[PDB]
């Protein structure tokens, strides 16, 4: 993947996170489970929604009747009408096919980017209070209860609150 | 001392939708939407809410001239398009040329 | 048939907001563009990599 996260350093997906595109799995003393990150998911949904509606609604065709009728002495204009009909067919077919190919590629990259960034937002909060153990997981150098966990998902993790305890276990 | 852990991850599900990308064919995605309308109702419908004029076994020439085989056709006071059948050949039962026939057909289409 | 439509083809009516169709090139109405494609499926979710 363009950014290295999806099918990358985070090897597989989670059939257990059913409520969102990206999110978190935690295990601490009081329990364990998945929780979707609601904010980043809604943003991506909004982004992708805008994209689909864009591809659909920017085509605003007028009322037309395609068929044309020509007699046996009007073959040249009949073939002109066919050249027209065939030209549009080739154009629309090429562009529709390529457009989808390109946006599908861009859509997957976008998800890849969002996961990478989610990971980076967490790494940046924790700094050295946890150890990067790969596969997208962080192992805390201090006890992390549900309150602590929620601060991390919300982005209000208190690095100095746990910094002393962590440094002890890190040493 | 196995510390508490928090992992980032992403949704996967049971979906089998595949899509093509510029770099890779048949990529399975968790969801996708179709842009290509590829089904019809097998019916000829009202357009703008107005029924078409159906000519049965007559063609436009036969209908508009009043070919005796077209007498049984009902003709509304308006219609949104015209339908002929591929076997509709009750036309000019007395042979000859219908001058500017196709122009007339286009004029009468709706 | 006693049905309404906004786009009629020789082999059946089409009721759709989608921008493309492979039913028939000869249509009447406010219709989707005819294309030769057999599949124009746009991805919205993500690559599916279950366990």
């Amino acid at each position, epitope marked *: 993947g363009l950014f290295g996260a999806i099918a990358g350093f985070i090897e597989g997906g989670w059939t257990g996170m059913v*409520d969102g595109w990206y999110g978190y799995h935690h295990q601490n003393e009081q329990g364990s489970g998945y929780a979707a990150d609601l904010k980043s998911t809604q943003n991506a*949904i*909004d982004g992708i929604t805008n994209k689909v*509606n864009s591809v659909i609604e920017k085509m605003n065709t007028q009322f037309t009747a395609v068929g044309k009728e020509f007699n046996h002495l009007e073959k040249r204009i009949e073939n002109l009408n066919k050249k027209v009909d065939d030209g549009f067919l080739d154009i629309w077919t090429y562009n529709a096919e390529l457009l989808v190919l390109l946006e599908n590629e861009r859509t997957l990259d976008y998800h890849d980017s969002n996961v990478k960034n989610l990971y980076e937002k967490v790494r940046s909060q924790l700094k050295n209070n946890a150890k990067e153990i790969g596969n997208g997981c962080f192992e805390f150098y201090h006890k992390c209860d549900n309150t602590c966990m929620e601060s991390v998902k919300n982005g209000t993790y208190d690095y100095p609150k746990y910094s002393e305890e962590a440094k002890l276990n890190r040493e | 001392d196995p510390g508490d852990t928090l992992c980032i991850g992403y949704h996967a599900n049971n979906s089998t939708d595949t899509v093509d990308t510029v770099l890779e064919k048949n990529v399975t995605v968790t969801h996708s*939407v179709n842009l290509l309308e590829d089904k019809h109702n097998g019916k000829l419908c009202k357009l703008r809410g107005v029924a078409p004029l159906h000519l049965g076994k007559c063609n436009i020439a036969g209908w508009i001239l009043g070919n005796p085989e077209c007498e049984s056709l009902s003709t509304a006071s308006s219609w949104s398009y015209i339908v002929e059948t591929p076997s509709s050949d009750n036309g000019t039962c007395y042979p000859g040329d219908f001058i500017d026939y196709e122009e007339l057909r286009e004029q009468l289409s709706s | 048939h006693d049905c309404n439509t906004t786009c009629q083809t020789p082999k059946g009516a089409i009721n759709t907001s989608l921008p493309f169709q492979n039913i028939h090139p000869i249509t009447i109405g406010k219709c989707p563009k005819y294309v030769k494609s057999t599949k124009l499926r746009l991805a919205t979710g993500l690559r599916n990599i279950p366990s």
Partner: antibody
Amino acid sequence: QVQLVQSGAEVKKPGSSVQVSCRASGGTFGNYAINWVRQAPGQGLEWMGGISPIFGPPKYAQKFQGRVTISADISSSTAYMDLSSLSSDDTAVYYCARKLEPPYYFYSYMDVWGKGTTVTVSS
Amino acid sequence: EIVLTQSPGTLSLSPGERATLSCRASQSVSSSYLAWYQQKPGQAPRLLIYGASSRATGIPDRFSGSGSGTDFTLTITRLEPEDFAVYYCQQYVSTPLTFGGGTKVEIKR
């Protein structure tokens, strides 16, 4: 402006199918979940399923597994509830309903309801 | 699963009086993913409470939710005449979404 507009009330014979529409009229369709809730005459409310067109595929309740399908037309801003597990005790009022303030892509609660489409299954 | 039974099926109270409806769950309930609706006959529901105690905008102050786990309560502190209707509780921690049976508050007389 944000309103859901249900299809007309309908009467279908037993065994056959019904399809109820629900046109949103506000904002860009697709980034919110639409739920389908059903209410038999003088009865509780049961949730059949719902869709968020873009987030993922429809999710259904087992009661209607194989008898119902929900789809959405992303351009026309419309969701469809198709039911053809048809009997006489499928006669009810059918509501489509959504959440209004985000995040609303998932099936949660519901601020905004249609007026309902009453559907009577009778030969 | 996670089915919610409401108690009592009907509640007879005269105006001005405290009404407290309850809603019990077959399984615990994720934080506070419980809404409360109000249906008057012939209409679709109005959302009263979400979260578990968060009042929906529009809803007058007399309505207040509370509770957690498998026990929730909806309290109406002064029944006005408008307030007489059926009240359904709904959960949304997990699909399938399930409602309550509903409690009908009626006018005691």
